[PDB]
Amino acid sequence: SRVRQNFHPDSEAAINRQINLELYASYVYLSMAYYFSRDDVALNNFSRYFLHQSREETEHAEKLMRLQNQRGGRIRLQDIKKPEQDDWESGLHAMECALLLEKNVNQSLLELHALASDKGDPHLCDFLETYYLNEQVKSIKELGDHVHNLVKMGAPDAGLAEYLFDTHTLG
Amino acid sequence: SRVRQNFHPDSEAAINRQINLELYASYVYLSMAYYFSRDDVALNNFSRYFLHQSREETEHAEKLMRLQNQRGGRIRLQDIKKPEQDDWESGLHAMECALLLEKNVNQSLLELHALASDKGDPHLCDFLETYYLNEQVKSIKELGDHVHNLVKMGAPDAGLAEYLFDTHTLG
Amino acid sequence: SRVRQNFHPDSEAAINRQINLELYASYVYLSMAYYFSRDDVALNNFSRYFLHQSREETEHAEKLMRLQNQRGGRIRLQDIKKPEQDDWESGLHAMECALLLEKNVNQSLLELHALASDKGDPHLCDFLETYYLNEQVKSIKELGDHVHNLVKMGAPDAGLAEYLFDTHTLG
Amino acid sequence: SRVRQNFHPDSEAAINRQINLELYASYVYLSMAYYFSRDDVALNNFSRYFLHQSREETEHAEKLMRLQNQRGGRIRLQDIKKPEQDDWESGLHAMECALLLEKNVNQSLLELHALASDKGDPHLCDFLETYYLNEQVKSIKELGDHVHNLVKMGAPDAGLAEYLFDTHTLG
Amino acid sequence: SRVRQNFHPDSEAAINRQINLELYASYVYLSMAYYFSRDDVALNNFSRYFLHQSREETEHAEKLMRLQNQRGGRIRLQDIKKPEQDDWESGLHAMECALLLEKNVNQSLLELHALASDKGDPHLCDFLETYYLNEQVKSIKELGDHVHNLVKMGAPDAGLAEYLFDTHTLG
Amino acid sequence: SRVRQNFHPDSEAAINRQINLELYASYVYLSMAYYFSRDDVALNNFSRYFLHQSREETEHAEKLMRLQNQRGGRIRLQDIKKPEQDDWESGLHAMECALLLEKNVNQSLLELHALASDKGDPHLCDFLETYYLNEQVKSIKELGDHVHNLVKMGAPDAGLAEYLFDTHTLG
Ligand SMILES: [Mg+2]
Ligand SMILES: [Mg+2]
Ligand SMILES: [Mg+2]
Ligand SMILES: [Mg+2]
Ligand SMILES: [Mg+2]
Ligand SMILES: [Mg+2]
Ligand SMILES: [Mg+2]
Ligand SMILES: [Mg+2]
Ligand SMILES: [Mg+2]
Ligand SMILES: [Mg+2]
Ligand SMILES: [Mg+2]
Ligand SMILES: [Mg+2]
Ligand SMILES: [Mg+2]
Ligand SMILES: [Mg+2]
Ligand SMILES: [Mg+2]
Ligand SMILES: [Mg+2]
Ligand SMILES: [Mg+2]
Ligand SMILES: [Mg+2]
Ligand SMILES: [Mg+2]
Ligand SMILES: [Mg+2]
Ligand SMILES: [Mg+2]
């Protein structure tokens, strides 16, 4: 590529793996969004919250695809795996799964950063630091806050918990 | 499901297959969008055109997921297969592939409609007719128009063809 | 902490020490602010300048406290030591002390960054780089500019120096 | 001091002690604010409520520092002691601690007023009456209201209590 | 310098070399701008494009000069070498030269970053990452896009190529 | 050149020399601008004044480059020599140097005009008279005014002189 410079093939490959992971995260959140709009779950603000998260993940994927093109790398897409469950059980369970998902994605981003550092790619490092790492920290913290409140409120067994959390925190 | 009424398990299953196909179409268009922003392709309006198509397909999938929930069906997601190519060759080739993709999706929607008709599900029939069938016809016609103009202009070999089409028609 | 990830206990501890240092810097500037509003000093723009610096330091402390919470660390507060003097002698002396204070705080932030780098915490590194390091450089440069002008003008002995600097530069 | 008039050295000293106490109160509230934004507490309106209280206490300190300067007294700062706890246990416990803190600060202000009265300093008396005494009464009453509601609601053990109080009363 | 801190003489020197390189890049683009406004070239949008690039390079130089002053380094200017050619041959050739120029400048910035990293200067690293590295990547990508389109269109020999590119892409 | 008319090769050459001189003047002023923003000089309005002069000189160069193209001449760039000093000593010294620089540039413009007159090029004469000669006279007069005031005020030794001149005249 006539634009390629200081861009290691390993970094290129890792960015393609990260693109897939971001699309996967988007899919997991899309699945959660629609679980909450089932007639037997019907927590509309949980639904909207996860739908919004899904859309943010798609943008995470797109920024990485754009990065690949900017650096002269070549996007290699792979199947986007379906989420682990179609039935997310409860608002609390979905939040705990989302928290695990974000920590796993964060671990992947940190490994990508370590690789970029090892390959002396400050541009890639800065890209990750600028658009991903703090976003992950904020997301993990937010999900943690949500999990804590849902647990304290008595979800999923306390009948008013998820309903009130949906209406107040996610409203 | 306490909301389920006149909703055949076969229709429920076919809607889940259609949801997957729509997500797949979205993925194909996302792939095309980013192929056109490669430094060695760089047709930005082809890129924007396909990105927009990708986003429309996601909405097609979401409406079907919403339909499933409204009718009391249960969404069962499957892996979203990667597109057939990562290198779409040219603006003309991508348009021809998009045309084939839309005809295939249309065939699937027509089969879904025939099933819905066979199962006496006027609501599903109307849903398909209202949000999908004419949309497909318009999309297929538009792609056909584009393919014709690109071919006539001499794409992909005539150096000015895709460039001019990108700037005038897709601009 | 269910949100904690890649956050070394040493980094957590260093952030708590930095929080204290920022609160201390805020206190030093608060002390300076009110020294300049004494009836026998009465340089109101020096007073306002330092009060503003004091408030900025409090925000520096708060961002670190927020960082601690985001990362899952636990804030451990310590006494905020009183400033070294209650009588800051002159506008020049206060500016020289502020310069020393900012260089000391900068050294602390650089040590924190080195620790974060050693612990492979790019998020913490980026946090420091984004909100602290350049802020320190700008502050040190500004104070240096002020010290130079006050010295050149003849402060503290030249009767018109601090008065004119207060009215023109800090006004 | 050429501005000093009818200002007893004992009053000057007591004002310096009060300045310290106000800074201490500010610190206690800052600590509480950030306890409520921990991922395992996550009551954001309790956090905002206490942060606001913290900022009000800083202004209480500043008004006393300004008073000292106006009267010709000399500000003598002392270490600001860290709060008694870093872990405030619960929204109810933090409110009860805040109530105790405000009653203690009020006792200090009343002793200051008695001293000012004994020294025949009507200006100081009026200053205390105007900016501090009623503020304390209003604060103590508000905290009392909050403590009562939290207790009645079943905090800290009733899972919905602090959550609902955070969203309704402190929202 | 009383503001100097953690600023290695080697970094200071490298920043002075980079300042010169940025001024040189500005000069190359100024030369290109005016080549395109020759009566026998007359591609006004190529002219405007390069003039704009020239002005951006001057700002790149100024930010580095400001950095030098902020850190306490001393700016040492050197002759700004004239560009390699006064006759840039064609719109395609000028774009290819600009691409080479930007890759060379990027290599220099990456070497500066490696030096700053070796000297443990996170502030300098962050400065480069924040204002230079991604800017270079975006510029190189843009030039690559332009080169690709001009080549595909048949520039410089196809009479309509540069003319159409000037009017559509650079317009 | 098919546009060339009544344009002597000597005039073409002299315009190229003048272009270089204008770029040189711009560089001298850029150097001065950043000397005044050193932490040990810190006269920000002197800095802004010279930066503005630098930018005006660049426009002087550009107008001559445009003139060359309009007349059918060919721009031949040469190295832009670095300024005689990096340390401009004082606000007064920089102003005296600027005055000498402008008188030297004016002498060059007057020689260019004499050449243009000798070659019977009224267009070139008028161009010089319209955009350069009076501009030089105004600039020389302004610098003279500044030098006089700085000298009278006691610069560079009188500590308040440059500071007050910076704040009042150049503010
Ligand atoms: Mg993501
Ligand atoms: Mg599988
Ligand atoms: Mg780094
Ligand atoms: Mg960075
Ligand atoms: Mg579709
Ligand atoms: Mg396969
Ligand atoms: Mg119908
Ligand atoms: Mg600070
Ligand atoms: Mg002590
Ligand atoms: Mg960073
Ligand atoms: Mg108080
Ligand atoms: Mg103690
Ligand atoms: Mg009374
Ligand atoms: Mg009264
Ligand atoms: Mg540059
Ligand atoms: Mg040479
Ligand atoms: Mg950075
Ligand atoms: Mg000039
Ligand atoms: Mg020389
Ligand atoms: Mg005339
Ligand atoms: Mg004045």
Secondary structure (DSSP) of F74-131: ------BPPPS-S---SHHHHHHHHHHHHHHHHHHHHHHHHHHHHTT-HHHHHHHIII
3-state SS string for D95-131: HHHHHHHHHHHHHHHHHHHHHHHHCCCHHHHHHHHHH
Binding-site positions of A for Fe cation: 22, 57, 60, 102, 136
Question: Directed axis angle between helix A9-35 and helix A44-71, to 10°?
Answer: 160
Q: Which of A71, A77, A84, A87 to mutate to test the interface with B (most CBs of B within 10 A)?
A: A77
Nearest to B76 by CA among E111, A157, A85: A85
Alpha carbon of E145: minimum distance to chain C alpha carbons (Å)? 31
Q: Say whether C61 sits in a helix, a strand or coil.
A: helix
CA E89, E90, E96, E97 dihedral sign is positive
Nearest to A110 by CA among A80, A139, A132: A132
Which residue from D minimizes the CA distance to C4?
Answer: D39
Reading the block at residue C79, the tokens are 């006494």
Question: Directed axis angle between helix C91-118 and helix C161-168, to 10°?
Answer: 60
Chain D neighbors of A163, CB-CB under 8 A = none
CA distance C126 to C132: 10
The answer to whether C102 is a known ligand-binding residue is yes
Task: For B39, list phi and psi in degrees, rounded to 5.
Answer: -65, -25
Hey, are the CB atoms on B42 and E149 less than 8 Å from each other?
A: yes
The CA F57 to ligand 18 mean position distance, Å, reads 4
User: Among the residues of chain C, which ranges form H helices?
Assistant: 9-35, 44-71, 91-118, 122-128, 134-153, 161-168
Which positions 102-121 of C are in contact with A (Cβ < 8 Å)? 120
Amino acid at residue number D55: R
Instruction: Please tell me which chains touch B, using 3 or more CB pairs under 8 Å as the contact test.
Output: A, E
Cβ-Cβ contacts under 8 Å between C and E: the total is: 45
CA distance E76 to E70: 15
Question: Directed axis angle between helix D9-35 and helix D91-118, to 10°?
Answer: 170
Bridge partners of F80? E80
The CA A31 to ligand 14 mean position distance, Å, reads 66
Please identify every residue whose CB atom is under 5 Å from ligand 10, which is an ion: A 129; C 126, 129
DSSP secondary-structure letter at E156?
Answer: T
D158 touches chain A (CB under 8 A): no
Hey, are the CB atoms on D42 and A154 less than 8 Å from each other?
A: no
Peptide bond into A83 cis (omega under 30): no
DSSP secondary-structure letter at B43?
Answer: -
Write the CB contacts of C80 (distance below 8 Å, at least 6 apart in sequence): C20, C23, C24, C27, D23, D27, D79, D80, D82
Bridge partners of D80? C80
Hey, how many other C-beta atoms are within 10 angstroms of the C-beta on A82?
Answer: 18
Q: Determine D/A contact with 3+ CB pairs under 8 A as the test.
A: yes
Reading the block at residue C90, the tokens are 């002159």
Nearest to E10 by CA among E116, E113, E93: E116
CA distance F73 to F65: 9
The answer to whether C12 is a known ligand-binding residue is no
First to last CA, chain F: 48
F89 touches chain C (CB under 8 A): no
CA distance F91 to F32: 9
Whether the CB-CB separation of B91 and B163 falls below 8 Å is answered with no
Reading the block at residue B91, the tokens are 């603006």
Yes or no: domain D1-171 corresponds to CATH 1.10.1040.10: no
CA distance A34 to A37: 5
**Residue E137 class from Cβ within 10 Å (0-12 exposed, 13-18 middle, 19+ buried)?**
buried
The CA-atom distances, in angstroms, between A104 and each of A25, A62, B6, B32 are 10, 19, 42, 29
DSSP secondary-structure letter at C31?
Answer: H
Letter string b/e over residues D72-95, b meaning 16 or more CB atoms within 10 A of that residue's CB? bbbbbbeebbbbeeeebebbbbbb
Whether the CB-CB separation of C95 and C143 falls below 8 Å is answered with yes
CA distance F94 to F97: 5
The CA-atom distances, in angstroms, between E139 and each of E56, E57, E98, E102, E134 are 11, 11, 9, 7, 8
Hey, are the CB atoms on D39 and A160 less than 8 Å from each other?
A: no
Whether the CB-CB separation of E68 and E19 falls below 8 Å is answered with yes
Binding-site positions of D for Fe cation: 22, 57, 60, 102, 136
Task: For C70, list phi and psi in degrees, rounded to 5.
Answer: -60, -40
CA distance D122 to D130: 12
A148 touches chain B (CB under 8 A): no
3-state SS string for chain A: CCCCCCCCHHHHHHHHHHHHHHHHHHHHHHHHHHHCCCCCCCCHHHHHHHHHHHHHHHHHHHHHHHHHHHHCCCCCCCCECCCCCCCCCCHHHHHHHHHHHHHHHHHHHHHHHHHHHHCCCHHHHHHHHHHHHHHHHHHHHHHHHHHHHHHHHCCCCCCCHHHHHHHHCCC
Whether the CB-CB separation of D31 and D57 falls below 8 Å is answered with no
CA distance D133 to B126: 72
Bridge partners of C80? D80
CA distance C5 to B167: 48
B41 touches chain E (CB under 8 A): yes
Alpha carbon of D86: minimum distance to chain C alpha carbons (Å)? 6
Q: Looking only at Cα atoms, what is the longest distance across chain E?
A: 61
CA B66, B68, B70, B74 dihedral sign is negative
A92 touches chain D (CB under 8 A): no
Whether the CB-CB separation of A109 and A128 falls below 8 Å is answered with yes
**Residue F24 class from Cβ within 10 Å (0-12 exposed, 13-18 middle, 19+ buried)?**
buried
Give me the count of residues in chain C. Answer: 171
Whether the CB-CB separation of E109 and A99 falls below 8 Å is answered with no
Whether the CB-CB separation of F163 and C149 falls below 8 Å is answered with yes
The CA E125 to ligand 4 mean position distance, Å, reads 7
C-alpha dihedral (B1, B7, B8, B13), degrees to nearest 10: -80
**Residue A117 class from Cβ within 10 Å (0-12 exposed, 13-18 middle, 19+ buried)?**
middle
Hey, are the CB atoms on A122 and E144 less than 8 Å from each other?
A: no
Cβ-Cβ contacts under 8 Å between E and F: the total is: 73
Q: Which of E15, E20, E34, E62 to mutate to test the interface with F (most CBs of F within 10 A)?
A: E34
* Residue whose pair of structure tokens reads 């025949």 in the numeric block: D120
What ranges do the domains of chain B cover?
1-171
Instruction: Please tell me which chains touch C, using 3 or more CB pairs under 8 Å as the contact test.
Output: A, D, E, F
CA B94, B100, B103, B107 dihedral sign is negative
Please identify every residue whose CB atom is under 5 Å from ligand 15, which is an ion: E 22, 57, 60
Whether the CB-CB separation of F170 and F50 falls below 8 Å is answered with no
Bridge partners of E80? F80
| Method used experimentally | X-ray
Hey, are the CB atoms on C3 and A110 less than 8 Å from each other?
A: no
Nearest to F87 by CA among D68, E151, E77: E77
Reading the block at residue C87, the tokens are 């009588």
Amino acid at residue number A37: S
B39 touches chain E (CB under 8 A): yes
CA distance E71 to E74: 9
H or E, element range at B56: helix B44-71
H or E, element range at C89: none
Reading the block at residue B28, the tokens are 């194909």
Reading the block at residue C105, the tokens are 């705080």
Hey, are the CB atoms on C107 and E5 less than 8 Å from each other?
A: yes
CA distance B128 to E169: 41
Give the ligand at the shortest distance from the Cα of D79.
9
Q: Say whether B96 sits in a helix, a strand or coil.
A: helix
Hey, are the CB atoms on E122 and C106 less than 8 Å from each other?
A: no
Q: Determine B/C contact with 3+ CB pairs under 8 A as the test.
A: no
Whether the CB-CB separation of A26 and A55 falls below 8 Å is answered with yes
CA B163 to chain centre: 24
CA D98, D103, D104, D110 dihedral sign is positive
Alpha carbon of E107: minimum distance to chain F alpha carbons (Å)? 23
Bridge partners of B80? A80
Give the ligand at the shortest distance from the Cα of C24.
8
The CA-atom distances, in angstroms, between A22 and each of A34, A58, A105, A125, C47 are 19, 7, 8, 18, 51
Hey, are the CB atoms on A113 and C122 less than 8 Å from each other?
A: yes
**Residue A145 class from Cβ within 10 Å (0-12 exposed, 13-18 middle, 19+ buried)?**
buried
User: Among the residues of E36-168, which ranges form H helices?
Assistant: 44-71, 91-118, 122-128, 134-153, 161-168
CA distance A69 to B146: 25
The CA-atom distances, in angstroms, between D63 and each of B112, D18, D70, D142 are 76, 11, 10, 22
Bridge partners of F169? none
Write the CB contacts of E68 (distance below 8 Å, at least 6 apart in sequence): E12, E15, E16, E19, E74, E75, F34
